[PDB]
Design an enzyme around this catalytic site. Structure first.
Site, PDB file in Angstrom:
ATOM      1  N   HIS A   1     115.185  20.788  62.907  1.00 50.08           N
ATOM      2  CA  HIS A   1     114.054  19.883  63.026  1.00 50.08           C
ATOM      3  C   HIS A   1     113.041  20.446  64.008  1.00 50.08           C
ATOM      4  CE1 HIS A   1     112.344  15.991  62.070  1.00 50.08           C
ATOM      5  NE2 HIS A   1     112.127  15.737  63.344  1.00 50.08           N
TER       6      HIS A   1
ATOM      7  N   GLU B   1     102.025   6.005  49.578  1.00 47.44           N
ATOM      8  CA  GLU B   1     101.120   6.842  50.373  1.00 47.44           C
ATOM      9  C   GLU B   1     100.539   6.190  51.638  1.00 47.44           C
ATOM     10  OE1 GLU B   1      98.576   8.135  46.862  1.00 47.44           O
ATOM     11  OE2 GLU B   1      99.199  10.106  47.656  1.00 47.44           O
TER      12      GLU B   1
ATOM     13  N   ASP C   1     107.481  19.209  60.114  1.00 46.11           N
ATOM     14  CA  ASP C   1     108.683  18.544  59.615  1.00 46.11           C
ATOM     15  C   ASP C   1     108.608  17.045  59.759  1.00 46.11           C
ATOM     16  OD1 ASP C   1     111.152  19.120  58.198  1.00 46.11           O
ATOM     17  OD2 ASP C   1     112.264  18.577  60.043  1.00 46.11           O
TER      18      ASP C   1
ATOM     19  N   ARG D   1     102.701   6.739  54.940  1.00 48.78           N
ATOM     20  CA  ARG D   1     103.154   8.099  55.227  1.00 48.78           C
ATOM     21  C   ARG D   1     102.098   9.182  55.036  1.00 48.78           C
ATOM     22  NH1 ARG D   1     103.309  10.970  50.347  1.00 48.78           N
ATOM     23  NH2 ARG D   1     104.123   9.727  48.587  1.00 48.78           N
TER      24      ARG D   1
ATOM     25  N   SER E   1     107.474  15.225  63.315  1.00 46.58           N
ATOM     26  CA  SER E   1     108.374  14.131  62.902  1.00 46.58           C
ATOM     27  C   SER E   1     107.593  12.822  62.644  1.00 46.58           C
ATOM     28  CB  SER E   1     109.507  13.971  63.944  1.00 46.58           C
ATOM     29  OG  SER E   1     110.691  13.410  63.384  1.00 46.58           O
ATOM     30  N   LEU E   2     107.890  11.748  63.387  1.00 44.16           N
ATOM     31  CA  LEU E   2     107.112  10.510  63.320  1.00 44.16           C
ATOM     32  C   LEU E   2     105.653  10.797  63.627  1.00 44.16           C
ATOM     33  CD1 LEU E   2     109.182   7.734  65.095  1.00 44.16           C
ATOM     34  CD2 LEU E   2     108.972   8.136  62.690  1.00 44.16           C
TER      35      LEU E   2
ATOM     36  N   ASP F   1      95.126  12.053  53.417  1.00 42.36           N
ATOM     37  CA  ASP F   1      94.857  11.590  54.789  1.00 42.36           C
ATOM     38  C   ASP F   1      93.914  12.486  55.619  1.00 42.36           C
ATOM     39  OD1 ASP F   1      96.597   9.265  54.442  1.00 42.36           O
ATOM     40  OD2 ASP F   1      98.295  10.655  54.590  1.00 42.36           O
TER      41      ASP F   1
ATOM     42  N   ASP G   1     100.205  12.234  53.407  1.00 43.85           N
ATOM     43  CA  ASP G   1      99.956  12.636  52.032  1.00 43.85           C
ATOM     44  C   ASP G   1      98.588  13.270  51.987  1.00 43.85           C
ATOM     45  OD1 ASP G   1      97.908  10.596  50.333  1.00 43.85           O
ATOM     46  OD2 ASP G   1      98.718   9.761  52.248  1.00 43.85           O
TER      47      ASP G   1
ATOM     48  N   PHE H   1     109.693  10.672  67.635  1.00 49.33           N
ATOM     49  CA  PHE H   1     110.714   9.793  68.192  1.00 49.33           C
ATOM     50  C   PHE H   1     111.348  10.296  69.490  1.00 49.33           C
ATOM     51  CE2 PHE H   1     114.965   7.543  67.538  1.00 49.33           C
ATOM     52  CZ  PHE H   1     114.480   6.346  67.985  1.00 49.33           C
TER      53      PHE H   1
HETATM   54 CA   LIG Z   1      98.873   8.151  53.905  1.00 51.94          CA
END
Ligand SMILES: [Ca+2]
Length: 435
Positions: free
Chosen positions: A251, A189, A178, A192, A154-155, A197, A194, A79
């Protein structure tokens, strides 16, 4: 609803993507032109200035310094951030000191300048576009997916995770630095990072919190094969409204630890543990016989790293500079002729340099009493040749020594012992010798 963007496919706003608790407004990602994603290639031959590759014209790849014969790593900022002249681009240079790499920096600055929940959407196109280029390298050049590493802050972590999922887990490694918690923590999942991936997923947790109360911007949730929680996960040493949480020290600390590990491979050994407390209390020490994992860059050398998910590891880091640290268990047994009040210290000595003095006990110092203590030395001495001991109280002048000291290395469990039932005045450095 849903939009489509050519070779990148379509994006619906159906649950779980939007209209959920954490994603309550029904949003959709901006156009690729608006997100303006860019792949900035750095190599050892162009370490300072990028070459701009793209997948749609794979001639750009060819005429770039890109080597088929070298590893390829992506670095994805998150971000309100960028790649060009910031931590991604410097992370490339670091890497170029220790190895031959194709450093590609996904730069989506424009797509990260927007409201957070809108960026949580743009993340998806950014993922698509990366997944496309990776394929491009595969179909168009015969490059192997199990050979690509995608690093995300982050993102950007979830952006890695999106591209990884697009590639059906064929991408050989994702490192999540992070990963953002807001909008992702405790979500399905698909939306995001996990362990599914990539063939190998490693995460560094540095600003972790639950969703409510909001104590930080990272994820408490474990989402890799290895989940490292340096300094307990929540608050890093060296960092002293939540309206800039994502640019807080804790962060950003994740990509500093990573960047450092690139140059200090064993700077960040992780010890396998259930909690931080267990680790603090050293119920967690020394390393397993078959090595600790090296948090950071050399995480991929860990034996059985893919054998289970959510393997938890704890460690402590330095507060500044390289941030490197090395756990030692330390065992002083006192000598003296009379009990006194003050504190006790120990320095470690190789033929390297020597360590700063570390505290071991405060208060009631008594001859014959022993004190034991885990400590975090900021640089590697290798073989401890000597140790020096110092105690300090204003005076009538009494003497206090260390009859014996045992230092254990966390790195490989080696026990050293040292010797001298022979006391010293206050603030004198007492030396003890091998035995
Ligand atoms: Ca995923």
């Amino acid at each position: 609803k849903e939009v489509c963007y050519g070779q990148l496919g379509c994006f619906s706003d159906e649950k779980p993507w939007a209209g959920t608790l954490q994603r309550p407004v029904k949003l959709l990602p901006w156009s690729p032109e608006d997100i303006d994603t860019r792949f900035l290639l750095y190599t050892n031959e162009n370490p300072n200035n990028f070459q701009l590759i793209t997948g749609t014209e794979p001639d750009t790849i060819e005429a770039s310094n890109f080597q088929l014969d070298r590893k390829t790593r992506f670095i994805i900022h998150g971000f309100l951030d960028k790649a060009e002249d910031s931590w991604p681009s410097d992370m490339c240079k670091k890497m170029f000191e220790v190895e031959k790499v194709n450093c590609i920096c996904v730069d989506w600055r424009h797509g990260s300048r927007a409201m957070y929940t809108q960026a949580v959407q743009n993340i998806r196109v950014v993922g698509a576009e990366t997944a496309f280029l990776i394929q491009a390298l595969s179909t168009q050049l015969g490059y192997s997916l199990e050979d690509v590493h995608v690093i995300g802050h982050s993102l950007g972590a979830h952006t890695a995770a999106e591209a990884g999922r697009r590639l059906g887990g064929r991408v050989g490694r994702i490192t999540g630095l992070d990963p953002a918690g807001p909008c992702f923590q405790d979500e399905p999942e698909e939306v995001r990072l996990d362990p599914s991936d990539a063939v190998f997923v490693d995460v560094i947790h540095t600003d972790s919190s639950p969703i409510v109360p909001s104590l930080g911007f990272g994820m408490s949730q474990k989402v890799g094969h290895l989940d490292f929680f340096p300094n307990g996960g929540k608050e890093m040493p060296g960092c002293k409204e939540g309206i800039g949480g994502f640019v807080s020290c804790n962060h950003l600390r994740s990509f500093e630890y990573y960047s450092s590990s690139v140059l200090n491979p064993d700077g960040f050994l992780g010890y396998p543990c259930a909690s931080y407390d267990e680790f603090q209390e050293s119920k967690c020490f020394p390393c397993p016989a078959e090595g600790c994992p090296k948090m950071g860059h050399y995480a991929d050398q860990f034996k059985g790293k893919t054998s289970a998910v959510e393997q938890t590891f704890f460690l402590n880091t330095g507060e500044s500079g390289q941030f490197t640290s090395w756990r030692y268990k330390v065992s002083v047994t006192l000598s003296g002729k009379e009990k006194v009040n003050g504190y006790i210290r120990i320095a470690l000595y190789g033929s390297n340099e020597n360590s700063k003095q570390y505290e071991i006990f405060k208060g009631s110092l008594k001859p014959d009493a022993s004190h034991t203590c885990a400590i975090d030395v900021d640089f590697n001495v290798g073989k401890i040749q000597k140790v020096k001991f110092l105690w300090n109280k204003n005076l009538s002048e009494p003497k206090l020594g260390a009859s014996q000291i045992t230092v254990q290395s966390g790195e490989d469990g080696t026990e050293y012992n040292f010797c001298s039932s022979d006391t010293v005045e206050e603030n004198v450095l007492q030396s003890l010798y091998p035995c």
